[model samples]
Structures are given as C-alpha cells and as structure tokens.
Target: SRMQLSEEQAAVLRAVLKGQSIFFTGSAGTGKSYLLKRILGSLPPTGTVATASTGVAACHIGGTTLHAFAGIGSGQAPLAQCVALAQRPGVRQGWLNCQRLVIDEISMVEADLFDKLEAVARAVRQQNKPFGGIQLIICGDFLQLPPVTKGSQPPRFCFQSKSWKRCVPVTLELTKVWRQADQTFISLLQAVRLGRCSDEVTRQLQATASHKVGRDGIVATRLCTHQDDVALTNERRLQELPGKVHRFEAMDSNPELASTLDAQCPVSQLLQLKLGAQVMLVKNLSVSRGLVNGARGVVVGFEAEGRGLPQVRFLCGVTEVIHADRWTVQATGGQLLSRQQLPLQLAWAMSIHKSQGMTLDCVEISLGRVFASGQAYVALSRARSLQGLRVLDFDPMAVRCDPRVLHFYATLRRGRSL
Candidate 1:
C-alpha cells in the first residue's frame, strides 16, 4: 500500500523502524491510526501484538483489547496472583513470543494497570528491561478522552506510570489534520482540543443548529449520550418506518462464545431490517470505495436469496448488496469466539464514545445529557463541516475537558514542544 504521509508521520514511522520506543499523540483525524497501521505492517508479524483500550478501537487496527492481550483480567489482581495468571501456558506464550507491543488509545489505560503489565512482562520474560525488552509503540491523544474507572476506583493516567518515560523514550505529536480541510473548522478543533473555548468558538458551533442535513438518504447519524438512548431511538425509528420487517439471525458456534460475540460484534445478533431504514456499515468491505465502518446508508430492499440480505444505497451514491460478515473475538488465550451476521447496524443514533476516530459529512448531536468532559467535543468533531452538523440542545458546559489532563499537557509543553 502506497501512502503520501506528512513529514511528521513519515518521521514517526522512521523512528519506529529504527528500534525506538515512541509515545505519539494527535487529535482526531490527525492520521494516528493511519500511521499505526503502517508501523504495524512494517514489523515482523510473528512476534508483534497490537492492542487498544476498547473493543471498537481494537477492531479498527485488527487487534484485541489491551487487557485481553495482556491476559490480565480486570488488571486489579495482586502482583503475585497476576504473575501466576500470566504464567498460564497460553498467557505465558503470548508474553514470551511478543517482541513488539503496539498499544493504541493509551490514554484509556490506567497507570496502575500499565505498571502491572510491565511487572508481568518482566516476570514472564525474565529480563530487567522495560516491558521485558519488548519494543513499545504507544498512540493516543490524552486531550480527547480520559481513562474510565468504576465508582471509588481511583483513576490513574498512563503517563503517570513509573516506566512511562523509560518505555517511551521518544515523543512525537502529529500536527496535520486530514479529515477536515476547512481552515476555520480546523482552528475550531484545535481550540477545543486544548480546552480553550472562547465566545467566538461557542458562537461558531451553535450557529450550525439551524442547518439541515441527512435529509436525502440518512446522510448523518445522531450522536447520543447513552447506549440505551441510541438503542431506543434506532429501534423506534426502524419500527416506525412503513415497511415489512426482515429478521436475520446470526450463526454461532457455542453459547459461551456466542455471548462473547454478542458483546464484541458491531451489529446486533438478531438484526431487524426494514426498507427505508437508516443503517451504517460496521465493517470495512472495500476501503477504496469508502465502504468502511461508520458509512451511512438507507435500506433499499432485500434479495429473495440466502437470509434475504438487504441492499443499501450509501451516502457516496453507491448502492451495495450487503452480505453476512464474520467477526472473530479473541475471548482468551487460545480461545476464539466467532459470529457470522450481516455487517449493517442501525445508524439512526450512536453513542459519542463510539463516534471517535470516525469522520462523517453530516451529524445530529444532542448535548442535553452530555455526561463527561470532552464528550461534546468528540461528538462535534465527527462532523466534516459546520454546515454538516446540527445540534439539538447545546450546552457549553458539555464540551468541557479534564483540567488535570490540560495541566499535564501544559507541563509537557513547558518541558518540550508538543
């Protein structure tokens, strides 16, 4: 694959190839995933393991969750028990064979979990090296999202890890933006990323409230605050459409694995499709044609064939006959869970967290219930232009960022340019 990378991206790739551990950061659409893919492709496949903080993010890079790959269940076990768990045959093999570990969405990793992982690696590999001598390639924008923790569970950012500086000796920040081309839009995003929102910026975003979009053929997806809201909205809208309901049941191997698939699959196991129903592609069928994840479309009809697969006309004016796709979940060390189902998912609404790393031409956002810092920013950045975005109920406070992260980045900049 040939790519014309920006000078900074090219430099990062070169640094990775030269056997240097790197900590790379960039805001959304800065080609962090793009560069990560190239870096992974350049490495020898056998001894390399790619991971992300969440399932959706892992799927983006053909990797598994960082906790799963680390074989650390919940990552809260005592150090002795954690080491014992890592010594299991299958888990130990993964740590023993892995020479390069690429962890995307590093911001979502807690500091204690990272330290535990480093300790386990050292124990398993029997080396006093950082991360047991494994080459680390870390990528994520701490400014976008913070680590998620349960109630009363203290949050620890990955950068606070004891081995962070030693493991990632080189640092790179991508400044180029590839998703949105408008200079004004780019500047607005820069301001939001740094948590520096001014009156002018607020006015600019609120100005898009009256704009109309997604009218032609499901051109935009509604961004919601919660998963239940997204589910209820999509379900209601799908049933409200005047058409015959078509049900597609997924084929699973076993109940245990089926349960795993239920959580990991992008599309629902019991998919309900209706003509004129809005949908989004959950998998990358053809990247060159823009038939990738988050691509929106409208259901035209279904074929009178296997499973009555539906045909969708996408926003790019391409009508495609969708088919059943399979997704494999690495349930555990040497345990794989797979599911075969249609790749189309309801797109009337999606949660803000899932909207990260996606670029959409049109978007409808409801910030009335925005629950976390940077949630609104993630929701808004999904739109390609101000004209393509429509805000239902806007609140400036919903677009806030964590002050700790802002201060951390500020400190880093004072030490060296970000």
Candidate 2:
C-alpha cells in the first residue's frame, strides 16, 4: 500500500513496455529493482526476460553476471565476447531472437563493454533492427562506488555511458524509501550524504562507551600495536565485547602475542559460534554471494573438529565441512548457496559503498571523511527511535559538501519543478 512510483520511475516503465531503450538512474535503494521485479511479475508468461549485472552484483536480482550474459564466460574484463561471438553466422541468428534485456548493478561495468554489447546487437539485428531489435533496460546509481578498472573508458559505459545518450529515450527515477525504519534514520542519512552529520550523531555514539570498567557493559580500548597485550585483548574481546579491549597486532612481527592466543580459537575457526560463543560476523552468505551486505547472520554448526581446525555452517546453507581456522563461509542472506539461494541479500560487513541501498533498524555507524552521496544516506538514516542511532565522529565544517554532489541535489530540485 505504501509503494508509490515517482515520476521518474514511471517513465522507465513506460519505455520498457514500449520496448524502447532506457536508463533508470537514481541513488541507492530507491526501489529500482523493486520496480523491475514487479514488471517481471506482470509480464505475460510467454514473454522472455533476462537480467544481468557485472561481477558480484549479479546476485541481487537472481540474474546472470554480466560477464556470463555478455558471453564473456570466464574471461577477464574488456570482454568482447558478444562482439566476438556475433562474428559467427549462428551467433548473429541467436542474438536476433532475443526479445528483451534488463541489466542491473551497472555501476561496475565499463563503457567499452557496453560498446561491444551494442556492436553485437546491431550486427544481429542488422540495420533494420528496431532499437537493435531488442528492448534494452539498464538501472544503476553512479556516485563512484566502483571505477571502471580494466575494460571500458570513463565517458561511455552502461547507464553512465555517454554513448548511451541517444539510446536511452526514457529515464526513470525512484525517490521514496520503501524499507527505511523511519524519518530520523532518513534525516541522519541525508546529513551524511550531504557530508553534514549533525553533532547529535557523534554524541549518541560516545554515549554508548560512557560506562566504566566492570560496569553495566564491558569497555575496551587499544592503540594500534603488535604485542602480547594486543593478542590477549583480542582473545578477551572474543570472550566478551564491551568487556574486551584489543590492540591490533600483526602475528609474524609479534610471535609471542600469537603464542598467547594460540590456545584461544581464531575467529575463522569459530565462525559458527555456539549459542553463546562470542563472535563477530566474518562476512555472511548474503554479500559474499553478491546481495547487499551487512544484514547479520549467525553461525549454527561446527566442523568435526573444534575451532582449532573447524568445519563451519551458517544459518544460511553455506557450509565448509573442513574449513581452515581463518575463514568464514559466506553466502547471500542467511540462505544456502544454491541456484535459489545465490540471489538472497547477505549479512556480513559492508564497505560504506555497499551499504548504500539498505536502511538499518538500529545503526552502529562510523564515518570518517571518506564517504559518498548514496552510501552516507542509507547508513546514517536507519532508525525508528533516537535510541537506535550511534555515530562515530563529526566536525562542524565537515559539513562542507562536494560541488558535484550539490549539483546533483540542484538538478533533482529542478527536475521536480519541471
């Protein structure tokens, strides 16, 4: 009942149905995929639909990786598989047969890749091709989450590509948040997106650390160091957080510290924590499989041996029967990794970049100077109550925003007026 299609997104839908080329751009978690899903559900049973994304993003929509869909298979980037394959008469015949294509998670693809894709499509459909004889839809948010590393050039790629300028006859955008916890979370995120976190966010996070040693909650602090003190602190924290303070230590440089914790289990060994075993997420099945990261899943099983040489299983179907003591068997969401499970959103840690689309119920957030428009928005703004908000730092003038970012807001404002 709450779902409302914004003016932008409606245009995208119109283009898709008309079989016109489109690029639907918006910030993260603005319901681009949600709209795609609804469209797929509404399509006639005989209609053919395919979805794809580059690299890890394929898992988000139960689609093939762009590499796979582009016929790149296991090859490296700068993939011209479609272009190369279309060289064959058989390939051209096959390409001309496809009815529609939907590409999601386009941020990671390069312009060269799209150019090659276009080349293949035009070859297959011939000059008479109606928009290359296949409906094309691409969705993405472009705020620099990933750089086009190897394959394409900067100016023209996927949804961000200038080459697509003429092809994208329609552009759709989604604005309202469907899954956010509340407005406080929403406002906090905007402040962050604008690089303007209020002092309030920092104050709330510090408040959590107010208790004294051996008080209501455990407290631990450490400077970066490599010594027995660091290892012991880590082990202690493993036993009980808030109770443990750990100094970071590189094991090779400090053998003594490593020895001190030798008897203690590694986090990898204990990935599947027992009912009360102290454990931090070591990435989960969700993000590992390419869905959104940081959802949070628990360990449910151990290998035949204990944490020393552990086998691990998670609430998700990801299982490592004989995993080493230093790794977590990650999956998407808490679901197992099967054809069905591969697309589920995961629970593990995410970079500020990956957390762009989600709204947290209660957030324990940390923001250094490094941040982005959509990412800052989703991370800081995910609370139904003030008690749920926690932020790590803030500077009054840190409120200064990038000019390009400001321009984005300005454009959005103008678009609304028009």
Candidate 3:
C-alpha cells in the first residue's frame, strides 16, 4: 500500500536497476526484504531465481533454498565433483537459464559453501565472469545471525568469501527505520546492534516489562532462548487449554524420508492442535492478507468433517480455515527427497533463532537463557513498538553483537562515504 521509499532505499533500487551486483544490509525493520521484493518484481521473471538459506525464508519470497536451486548437490564435494553435479541435464538447464540470482538471508550462507557455488556456476556456464555473468542480489544483516559452522572449522561469513568482492561490487546499508516510530526505541536498537548498551537504554527496556495479566492475550507470542524451552512452553500451554486435541498425522512417502522430513519441516509430524492454543503460520499463505509465515493467531474452533478443519482467528482480525500445505525437501543431488505437511505450528513460545524475519505486533522475551550474541536484539526487535514488547528478564550481558560484524559494517560505511 505504501510506494514511498526512503532516499537510501531509492538509491539501492537504482543500483539494482542499473544491473549492478549489490550486497544490501540493514538492521532489523529497515525494510531490506521489502526492497528485495521490489527489485525482484522489476526483473524479468523467466531468468530470475530467488533463493534463501532456509526453507521458511524461501517460502516468504515464493522461492526455494539456494542449495536446491543451485543443483550442485551437498556442495561438500570437490570442485570437479560439484561442477559435474551441476552439469547434470536438469541442473545444467537451470544454471543456463538463470540470469539474475537473488540470495536472501545471506548471513546464514557459510564461506566454504559459497565458494563451491561460485566454482560450479563458472564451470557449468563456461564463463570466467563473477557468478558466471549472472547479476547477484545479496541481502542480509550480519549482525543478526552468524553462519553455521561444523566441527572446529572456523565460522566464515559470506562477505569473507573469495568471490564476494567480485560478485557484489556495490554494498548498500539501509539506515531508515520503518518498523518502530519511537525515536528512543530506535536509538536503543541501534546501540544493541553495535554491541553497545547504555544504562539508560537498559532502564527504558526494563520499564516496559510486563507481568501476567488478562491483557496478555493480545501479546503475539513469547521468544525463548532455547528450542527445548519453546517446545515445553508451547506443549504445556496447549495441554492447559480446555479442548479435545485434534491429532493430525502427516502422510510421508517413505519412513526413512519421513525422519528427515520431521527435522526439516516447519510443522510437527504429529501435530497436536487444540482449540484456544496459540498458533503461527508455518508457511506463506498470502502475503497481502498478512497470512505469511510466523503470523500469530489463536485457534478459535473447528469446521468440516470428523475432527474438522481448525479455524484460526489471526491478530489482524482475519479468521481463516487452516489447511494442510505441502513442502518438498530435496536431496543434495537435486533428487526429490520427501513431501511433508505445513501450514500451522504451535507458537505460544518460539526460539529467538526461528523468530528472525518475523514482524510481531507483540512479543514477550526472556533473556535469562540467551547465550548467543545479538539474541537479545533479535528478540526485542521482533515487536513493532515498545508498547508491544514485554521482557521477563533483562540482562545487559545478553545483549551483544559480534564485534567483527560491527567492524565490517563500519568499513562499508566508510567506503560509501568516500
């Protein structure tokens, strides 16, 4: 509904239209994804491929995971093997057809995997150009989440990759805040993003702390520091509600594939849904109606047959009949692994990691168990306003950003100013 763009956003769009491979970053609520959507829409749909590091993220952009789209398999194989993998008939066609590649949530893509992708792109496309002459649109805020590292291997950011400079020549950092209007809240978030915490900022956040009350029903959901905590909280709360639990079992193609699907699928394999339980949309149903992933709602009742279809009344006042959606997980070699169920997940409490990219009208966070840097900032920024946030505990130590990321952004700002 809004066409107006900040001067910074307009400049970034101009660069994209100019066919420049750009790396765009911003703090939470800076509208990085919004701008990426605009750029993707402006491009030719036939030759453009939108991808993200995770399936949930990919669904938001109506795309697939980068690994699935790349067709290079696990990306752990040697450079020659990866090239061969990409040269497979179907894989080769995808690479040959793609002209614009948009990689969202780039902060999660590790350097080692990124290099393999570059090597395969060059080999398959038979071009010496960066990314095999394809235009790149990379978007993510490094300060939010770090890359996943295995064993003792050093965690490598995508910007540290050998092909980073060659693939993305223009770096844009969005400075305008579109989510929260409070100047004080905006300043507090900026300090948190830079790993800085002033006494005043801490005091202000603490002042917004909420206690259990009747009005708490309006709170979107709680942000937990651990997955187990979120699970226990949701389960316990679900059971506490008074209703007959409707058990929906997912139909899997194979038992072995079912195991993998259970891990990858956003919805639970044996979904135990109950009336009055809080739920979140695990898939993107409709972005226009705010029915996208992570949208919070309460199970009002059921309709249809035997147990009936669950009806969720979203916080936006839209009540929809929740339907089972399908998600297909691909093997490393671009093989069809399994198709699983989607649509709904218990959301009384969600881990801070899963809460990323979700804009909530209200959020309750507990920082007591926060172990990772930037977890607090990620949790707090999920809310659209200070009034919409409630903190059970506030620890200054829990609020921190990786210093290396801070330095990286500083360098980008310096380069832009020059």
Candidate 4:
C-alpha cells in the first residue's frame, strides 16, 4: 500500500514493532486515529490485533475493552455471580492467544483504569509468565482532557493533566487546523482555552439567553431552578419552568418534583441532545474523580432498561448511570439519567470533547485555566465562529504558564524542537 507517514508517527510505529510500548499524543483532530489504523492495517494479515477506547471507543472500532479482551468482565458483583465461567477451557484459550492491543481516545481514561487493563492483559496472556508478551499501542490526545473525575479521585487514580508524570511518554503534533475556516472561529476558540470566555463573546451569549433568578442557567436532569435560584442575588420572576418529566426510580417518585422536571436525556441509539434541548449541568462533582482535572463533557444519550435503570452516555463513550444525589445536566445537549433509567433528550449544551463528532451553528465558551493541560486548546478550537460565540473567563498569564510545565509538555510531544 502506498503510505504517507509523518516523520513523527512513523517513529512511534517503529518503536511499537520493536516491542516498545508507544504513547502517541497530539492535538485534537491531528489524525492519531488515522495513523493507528494505518499501522494496524499494514501489519501482516496473520498477525492479530485489538483496538479499543476505554469502553465505548472499542465499540466504534468494532473491538472490546482491553479488560474484556483480557477476559475481565463486569464489576465484582457481576463477576462473582459467574465464577464457573472462568472454568470454561475455551474462554481461557481465547484470552491466552490474544496479542497486539490498541487503545484509542485515551484522554478520558484514568490511571486506575489503565492499570486494571494492563493487569488483566498480563494475567491472561502470560498465564504462568511474569508480564504479558503481547505488544501494546496507546493512542490519544491526553492534552485534550483528563479522564472525568467526579469528585475526590481515588489515590490510585490521582493524575494531574498538566503534570508530566502521567502523559504518554512520546508524541506527534498536528499543527494545522483542518476543520475550521474563517480565522475568527479559530480566534474565538483560542480565547476559551481557559474556562472563561472573552468579554465580547460572553456579552453576546448573555444577550441571547434571558436571565431569571432561578430559571436562567441551562437546565439538566432535574428541576435545579430552586437550587440555582437560591444563590441568585438578582431576580426576575423565578417562574416554574416547563418540562416533560417521567419518574422511573422509586427514589424519584416524589410527585411534585417529577411533575415539573423537564425531559432531559432519554434513552436512544442516536445522539440524544439536539440543537435546542434545555439540559442541566451535572452538579454531582463527585464524578469529577472519574475525569481528568477540568475535563468537560455532555450527556449524549441514555442507555435505557426496565424500571428506569439508565446510564448517561456522554461523548467519547462515557456512560455514567445517574444516581440519587442530584446532578446538574446543562441543557447543553442530549439526555440525562438516574443510574436507573435511559431516556434520551434533545435540549442541551456541550463541551468541546462531546462536541467533536458534531457541528454547530454557533458556540459560547472560554479558555480554561492557564498552565493547565493541552486539552484547553483542543476544546476551544472546535467552534465555527467568534460572532457565534462567547467567552466566560481567561487567565492573567494568558500567553504563557510555568516553564517547567511547558518543558514537560514538550517532552510529551517527543521534543521535536530540533
């Protein structure tokens, strides 16, 4: 096959075939996935390989998780129920022969998740050996976002996205913007790399949406107006909002609350959040532990089941089951869940990561913290316009951050400074 390998991607591929694990990172839309696919397809037909992205990316590539490939099934409770499954000789043999694994969209994948994946692979492939003989290739732009952290991360999962210690050791960079036109779109995006957007953009956005004391900000899974309004010093009539609500979990049977709750993310195969679905931002910060620091995502859909046991499916294959404690689901886009039922919705907004696979007429955002991770740039650059935008906040050191952090990122990008 006629092939075009960037000088950088080629080096990583060579390292992989040489039995060295390759950590490939780049800016968003930099063709990391393309390069990995090319490498996989280029391998001899007799060679077997596995492709995955945490849990859902695997589905996109028609593969299972590293854990699944390694023979680890669901949670401990589920696994405990089927101890006999482990005794099946055929199941054991399937895992034994597996070699060559690929994990994609790793930005949201946590350290503990990676360790568990590696451990399972080793146990399955080595059987009686110390380490799995299988080769591994990990591909993604960790700079784009850290795995979601709901709240306090488990010590094992403590990872600072800006810290050099946690990133892929080597990487390639795709510098040109392939997805946007008009430099204003790029300019506006650059402004939001930090969490706050520029003033011009913010003013424009604020004008579009009317603000009420409680009912204003985007709505999500539940009626958060009460909570949201309590903090508002300013006021307009805090009206009772309108929404199509359903009660699934026994815990959610509070009739008064359910009656006014808007229908957010409903269960669906298609992307649930539409162009105008009013959703709420998840307030359950505990899930932050499940994410990289400052990582942002949106509800894409709900995986529905009987009795309302549903999961909030986000972009990049993150399906978190909504639980009892209220979470703020910003009507950014998509459905909301209760860890019990799957219902899809069309009203919502989204962060850049979840917005990647789709397009928008306009957007409002801000550059995230300075000296944070590389994801800020990736997320900001996704929008199509500055006129169609807003900026919330920005950094004082908007131009630069700690030098040590810069050097660390440079190393992660493979020190191509030569």
Cα lDDT of all candidates, in order?
Answer: 0.79, 0.44, 0.77, 0.41
TM-score of 4: 0.49
Q: Which residues of candidate 2, in runs, are more than 4 Å off?
A: 1-15, 45-47, 52-57, 73-82, 85-95, 127-131, 144-160, 195-295, 302-348, 353-363, 369-389, 394-418
Candidate ranking under TM-score, highest first, comes to: 1, 3, 2, 4
Model 1 residue runs over 4 Å out of place are none
lDDT of 2 by residue, 3-120 (tens): 6676666666766776667767655457776777666655453434455443224334444444434343323334355456554544344456667777776655666666666656
lDDT of 4 by residue, 31-134 (tens): 66666767776655343555553433442344444444433343233323323333245545554655655677665655555554444445545444222555
Least well predicted 10-residue stretch by lDDT in candidate 4: 327-336
List residue ranges in candidate 3 displaced over 4 A.
Answer: 72-74, 211-218, 253-255, 287-289, 304-307, 337-342
Candidate 4, after superposition: displacement of residue 154 in Å? 6.7
| lDDT by residue (tens digit), candidate 1, 281-397 | 777778888787677899999988777889998887788898887777655545656788888778888887777755778888876554577776777777877677787766667
Which candidate leads the pack in TM-score? 1
What lDDT is obtained when candidate 2 is compared to the true structure? 0.44
Cα TM-score of candidate 3: 0.92
